[PDB]
Paper text:
The endothelin ETB receptor is a promiscuous G-protein coupled receptor that is activated by vasoactive peptide endothelins. By contrast, the ETB receptor primarily induces vasorelaxation via the nitric oxide-mediated pathway, and it acts as a clearance receptor that removes circulating ET-1 via the lysosomal pathway Bremnes et al., 2000. Here, we report the 2.8 Å-resolution cryo-electron microscopy (cryo-EM) structure of the human ETB-Gi signaling complex bound to ET-1, revealing the unique mechanisms of receptor activation and G-protein coupling.
The structure of the purified complex was determined by single-particle cryo-EM analysis with an overall resolution of 2.8  Å. No density corresponding to NanoBiT was observed in the 2D class averages and reconstructed 3D density map, as in the previous structural studies using the NanoBiT tethering strategy Duan et al., 2020; Xia et al., 2021; Wang et al., 2021; Xu et al., 2022b. Compared with other GPCR-G-protein complexes, ETB binds Gi in the shallowest position, further expanding the diversity of G-protein binding modes. On ICL2, W206ICL2 fits into a hydrophobic pocket formed by L194G.S3.01, F336G.H5.08, T340G.H5.12, I343G.H5.15, and I344G.H5.16 in the Gαi subunit. Moreover, ICL2 forms extensive van der Waals interactions with the αN, which are not observed in other GPCR-Gi complexes. Along with this motion, L3867.53 directly forms a hydrophobic contact with G352G.H5.24. Nevertheless, the Gαi structure adopts a nucleic acid-free state, similar to the μOR-Gi complex.
Numbering used by the authors:
A (entry chain C): 9 to 61
B (entry chain A): 3 to 55, 182 to 233, 241 to 354
C (entry chain R): 88 to 403
D (entry chain B): 5 to 340
E (entry chain E): 2 to 121, 124 to 235
F (entry chain L): 1 to 21
The structure:
């Protein structure tokens, strides 16, 4: 009566979610990976003068 | 060179650290790493005490100018075997199972699956395994209890103490899937003196000699 | 001057020598190249003894390449139209390769002894450094000891029964007294340094290693058994690797000492000896090349790791 | 039964609501994005000195200092610009699977099979490195120590639970339970208020470090999850499992975003990390190599081919100028 | 952390003496050691340096070849042996620790010093003034110039700002260009470029008075400044 | 090969025929 009550309570807490769907939520990773691409030295190679390696 | 007066001293410190690292690694590569394994209620707190003296339990002892480090298994509770690959390159595996293992109830299933797991692992198949049956206080008084058909229907013949031990050793030899590389060292003694340490010392001496021969291309 | 008989080599012996030399040459190149490929390609077999074995294989390959084709040319042409420079250089390369091979054998025997006598972490964090200075020392000694061969030879012309011939060889007349002593003790030095010393060193070190391996004192102190016969087997292999070397390097030095002992002058009792010595020298050098070839076969048929490496290389 | 039926029906209705509202997978929308080509990354520096199997490595906050943990009980602090060994720490326990760099550069917390997270102080007054605090209280092997502040760190273990600590006191401040297997990895969010942990029950989950609720759960793998790491914006994460698959999950979608598996790939992922932009998902694999997946297209857009053994740990500098890869061949390689 | 010196006294010209530096409170075996001297009411002057493990040893070209440096790491002692002394060797001798790695402070701690009396190319550092009167609460800017540019190719500037209170020993204030020491109030700051370097002090306190020194590391031999003494 | 001097034609002919060693 009280071993799975916490599990179902968490699932109820897992129900009342501000549900952002995978098409609403893919835009987050898309925008972040596009807006920070120019400052990534691995995706875009750095000029040899600024490279400390 | 092109280095500033401070970077030269930094390089000197780094080279001294290199020197210390190789100096301690020379001692680290001269130490025998033994893994200790066993089934539930098999007995591991009786052989580690015979050695010349929480999570992982480390036992250090020097025997005949060889520094042995033994790493115990009785400190873990999760049997997912995510830490076995950390024991690649160890000298040997002391695995412990007793003849009285079918008293806690069946000796086939869990113990023999543990053997086949350590005999199927890619990392351990090239590492020798040492087998122990140490005590001689209860290994004789429970063979004559009843025919083993209750839990051991593979054998239904004559059963003395020596015959049963030989048959168990033979079925262990049958458990080993590939004898090309790995070698089993079974031991049938009395847990009364320091014979276990001498046996493990001889086994590690032999496996190290064989690794030396393979390294030289002679084996 | 005539010996009541000319000098010639039978054509059947020439055919047999050609076939034997071709087979040994091909087998030696295949084995040594595959062994070198195995040693270089695999990083886990990159270490001291493997580097020594690679050096041995490289020296054996260079020896075969520098010996077999030129002897084939000598047999099939009986002429040396190629000048004085590379006839000066070839004996230098030959003696350097022989020295490299024998010193690598000695060093390898010492290493195999050490692996079984100082077994306790004899492989510790690797030792490519001391092996490096050892290999450099061996190569420098072998090169410097072959320089007299790189100074000695010269081409001299002669007329023999109407035939005009040119021969490149060790000219008896030389500049320095030490060089003349070298010219007089060439074969003795070769027999005493390139044959007796490596044989003694390898045999002694391997005997100590075998003794240490089979050094069982307490009767059945451990029930291990089984692989004691395996140690017996590898010891037998070790002693066979020495017997093949001895039996395959003996005939050349034997021929040279018979040349130094039984050769006479001003009487017709020397030409048949030379006719025999031609064939004996050719057979001896052929079986020396066979000994050069012999090592990868033993490594394949003894070492399981090397057996698998050879199978993977040849079958794919 | 009633409670079992209630749990089953709640799970079924949550799954049905999740499916009926989910529009399309990440690939279906991002297919129009052009690829990145082939990320050819060359070893600029090779760090030598570790004489055993290398298990953990973490970059410093200044993108120049590194800490590396090896089997021989050594935690080496490297200067990544000149290959200078700034520090060499002899660890008490040689069996380490994780350790990290404090965000202020003062401390290093490191551990493994000892079930103890030992934290050493670097900027001392005696010029050496001493052990500051040993955190104990776990009953299984340790993983993914990650500092929050100079007095606060979260560590995962095989007790199917994680713990939030307080370094000055040394007592376990908070405990997050709910997993049903050996928890192998955790990653801290950039905002340092949430984290995620993946376990051997083929499930990961998002936990709140402040009040300790099981905020979200995530499934979809078939076997043990060995590595996990957030997207740099703290709204998603990626796991790597023994199924030879990486999976990107999203912290708001409540299920898997997408998968990074290939037919030729047979061995599992043991390390995972993200580039600074969150575009190149780098995964250190079990065979020998590190695969630079495009975290949007699941394409093998680059392979780091060194490391004659299995690439056991990955790391990206906070500026993203280099990638450190550590393997069991006792070497780190720094790539650019 | 405690470095204490011994061996001072009065010596006749042509004699030989020995100074000992004993350390207690840190890792002596991991610190290189410097011997510095200060002429009476004239200024500081570097004398000698020995690296960690006794690998690199440097002497000042002024008395190069005449002095010698000995070290005992297992005993934590630094020896400076003097062979022939002219009328210039009389001075106040200081012992300094110096550890070298990325981000360290290699001049943090100085010794107490000992007195020595004798009976009767290089970078030049220029200090603008020698006596400046000021009252507490007023910001004070000190400046000093160098011959060559201290800016190395790494980006490091090798300038060390020390303070010597009257009756005390010098103490590090800044070690490379603008990096505060350990245990020092955060009101001191440093800035400048290339050859012109300024030390700024805001909210001056009563015990901040004393002689300020700027030195270059950058190379050997090490050279000190003239010494700017603040008045109050 | 090795000869005493040039007057021994047989030795030089053998050197011509013999191997280079």
């Amino acid at each position: 009566i009280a071993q799975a009550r916490k599990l179902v309570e968490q699932l109820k807490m897992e129900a009342n979610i501000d549900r952002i769907k995978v098409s609403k939520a893919a835009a987050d990773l898309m925008a972040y990976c596009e807006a920070h691409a120019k400052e990534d030295p691995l995706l875009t190679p750095v000029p040899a003068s600024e490279n400390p390696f | 060179c092109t280095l500033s007066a401070e970077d030269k001293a930094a390089v000197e410190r780094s080279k001294m650290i290199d020197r210390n690292l190789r100096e301690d690694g020379e001692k680290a590569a001269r130490e025998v790493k033994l893994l200790l394994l066993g089934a539930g209620e098999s007995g591991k707190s009786t052989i580690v005490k015979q050695m010349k003296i929480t999570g992982i339990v480390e036992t250090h002892f020097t025997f005949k100018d060889l520094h042995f480090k033994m790493f115990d298994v009785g400190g873990q509770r999760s049997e997912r075997k995510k830490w076995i690959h950390c024991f690649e390159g160890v000298t040997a595996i002391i695995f412990c199972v007793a003849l009285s293992d079918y008293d806690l109830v069946n000796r086939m299933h869990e113990s023999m699956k543990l053997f086949d797991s350590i005999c199927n692992n890619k990392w351990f198949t090239d590492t020798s395994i040492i087998l122990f049956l140490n005590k001689k206080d209860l290994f004789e008084e429970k063979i004559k209890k009843s025919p083993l058909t209750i839990c051991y229907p593979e054998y239904a013949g004559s059963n003395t103490y020596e015959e049963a031990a030989a048959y168990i050793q033979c079925q262990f030899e049958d458990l080993n899937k590939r004898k090309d590389t790995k070698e089993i060292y079974t031991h049938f003694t009395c847990a009364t003196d320091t014979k276990n340490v001498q046996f493990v010392f001889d086994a590690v001496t032999d496996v190290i000699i064989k690794n030396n021969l393979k390294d030289c291309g002679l084996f | 001057p005539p010996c009541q008989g000319p000098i010639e080599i039978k054509e059947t012996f020439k055919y047999i020598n050609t076939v034997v030399s071709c087979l040994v040459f091909v087998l030696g190149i295949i084995g040594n190249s595959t062994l070198l490929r195995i040693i270089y390609k695999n990083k886990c077999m990159r270490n001291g003894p493997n580097i020594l074995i690679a050096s041995l294989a490289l020296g054996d390959l260079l020896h075969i390449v520098i010996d077999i084709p030129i002897n084939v040319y000598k047999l099939l042409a009986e002429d040396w139209p190629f000048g004085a420079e590379m006839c000066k250089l070839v004996p230098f390369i030959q003696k350097a390769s022989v020295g490299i091979t024998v010193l690598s054998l000695c060093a390898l025997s010492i290493d195999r002894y050490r692996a079984v006598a100082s077994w306790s972490r004899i492989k510790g964090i690797g030792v490519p450094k001391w092996t490096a200075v050892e290999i450099v020392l061996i190569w420098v000694v072998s090169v410097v000891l072959a320089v007299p061969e790189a100074i000695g030879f010269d081409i001299i012309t002669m007329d023999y029964k109407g035939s005009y011939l040119r021969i490149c060889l060790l000219h008896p007349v030389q500049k320095t007294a030490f060089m003349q002593f070298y010219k007089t003790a060439k074969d003795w030095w070769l027999f005493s340094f390139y044959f007796c010393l490596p044989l003694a060193i390898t045999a002694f070190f391997y005997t100590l290693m075998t003794c240490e391996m089979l050094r069982k004192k307490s009767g059945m102190q451990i029930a291990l058994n089984d692989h004691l016969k395996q140690r017996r087997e590898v010891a037998k292999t070790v002693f066979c690797l020495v017997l093949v070397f001895a039996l395959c390097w003996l005939p050349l030095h034997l021929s040279r000492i018979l040349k130094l002992t039984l050769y006479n002058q001003n009487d017709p009792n020397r030409c048949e000896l030379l006719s025999f010595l031609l064939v004996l020298d050719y057979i001896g050098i052929n079986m020396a090349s066979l000994n050069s070839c012999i090592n990868p076969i033993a490594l394949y048929l003894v070492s399981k790791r090397f057996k698998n490496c050879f199978k993977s290389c040849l079958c794919c | 039964d009633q409670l079992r039926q209630e749990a089953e029906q709640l799970k079924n209705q949550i799954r049905d609501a999740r499916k009926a509202c989910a529009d399309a997978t990440l690939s279906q929308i991002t297919n129009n994005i052009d690829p990145v080509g082939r990320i050819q990354m060359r070893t600029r520096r090779t760090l030598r000195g570790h004489l055993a199997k290398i298990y953990a490595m973490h970059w410093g906050t200044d993108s120049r200092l590194l800490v590396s943990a090896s089997q021989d009980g050594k935690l080496i602090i490297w200067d990544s610009y000149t290959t200078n060994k700034v520090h060499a720490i002899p660890l008490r326990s040689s069996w380490v699977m994780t350790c990290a760099y404090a965000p202020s550069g003062n401390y290093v917390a490191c551990g493994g099979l000892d079930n103890i997270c030992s934290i050493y102080n670097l900027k001392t007054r005696e010029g050496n490195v001493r052990v500051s605090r040993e955190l104990a209280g776990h009953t299984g092997y340790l993983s993914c120590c990650r500092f929050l502040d100079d007095n606060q760190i979260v560590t995962s273990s095989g007790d199917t639970t994680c713990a939030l600590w307080d370094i000055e006191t040394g007592q376990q401040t908070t405990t997050f339970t709910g997993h049903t297997g050996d928890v192998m990895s955790l990653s801290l969010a950039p905002d340092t208020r949430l984290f995620v942990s993946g376990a051997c029950d083929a499930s990961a989950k998002l936990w709140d470090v402040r009040e300790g609720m099981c905020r979200q759960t995530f499934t979809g793998h078939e076997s043990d999850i060995n590595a996990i790491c957030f997207f740099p914006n703290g709204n998603a994460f990626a796991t790597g499992s023994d199924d030879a698959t990486c999976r990107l999950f999203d912290l708001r979608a409540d299920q898997e975003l997408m998968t990074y598996s290939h037919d030729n790939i047979i061995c599992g992922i043991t390390s995972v990390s993200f580039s600074k932009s969150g575009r190149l998902l780098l995964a250190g694999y079990d065979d020998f190599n590190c695969n630079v997946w495009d975290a949007l297209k699941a394409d093998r857009a680059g392979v780091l081919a060194g490391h004659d053994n299995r690439v056991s740990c990955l790391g990206v500098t906070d500026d993203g100028m280099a990638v450190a890869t550590g393997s069991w061949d006792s070497f780190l390689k720094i790539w650019n | 952390v405690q470095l204490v010196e011994s061996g001072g006294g009065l010596v006749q010209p042509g004699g030989s003496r020995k100074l000992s530096c004993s350390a207690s409170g840190f890792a002596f075996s991991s610190f290189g050691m410097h011997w510095v001297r200060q002429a009476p009411e004239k200024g500081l002057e570097w004398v000698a340096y020995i690296s960690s493990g006794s690998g690199t040893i440097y002497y000042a070209d002024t008395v190069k070849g005449r002095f010698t440096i000995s070290r005992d790491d297992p005993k934590n002692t630094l020896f400076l042996q003097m062979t022939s002394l002219r009328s210039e060797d009389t001075a106040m001798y200081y012992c300094v620790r110096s550890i070298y790695y990325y981000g360290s402070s290699p001049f943090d701690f100085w010794g107490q010093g000992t007195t020595l009396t004798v009976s009767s190319s290089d970078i030049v550092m220029t200090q603008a003034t020698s006596s400046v009167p000021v009252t507490p609460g007023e910001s004070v800017s000190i400046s000093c110039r160098s011959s060559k540019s201290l800016l190395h190719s790494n980006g490091n500037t090798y300038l060390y700002w020390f303070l010597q209170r009257p009756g005390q020993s010098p103490q590090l204030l800044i070690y490379r260009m603008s990096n505060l020491a350990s245990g020092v109030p955060d009101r001191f700051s440093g800035s400048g470029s290339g050859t012109a370097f300024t030390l700024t002090i805001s909210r001056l306190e009563a015990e901040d008075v004393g002689v300020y020194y700027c030195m270059q590391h950058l190379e050997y031999p090490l050279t000190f400044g003239a010494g700017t003494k603040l008045e109050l | 090969c090795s000869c005493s001097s040039l007057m021994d034609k047989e030795c030089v002919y053998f050197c011509h025929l013999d191997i280079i060693w």
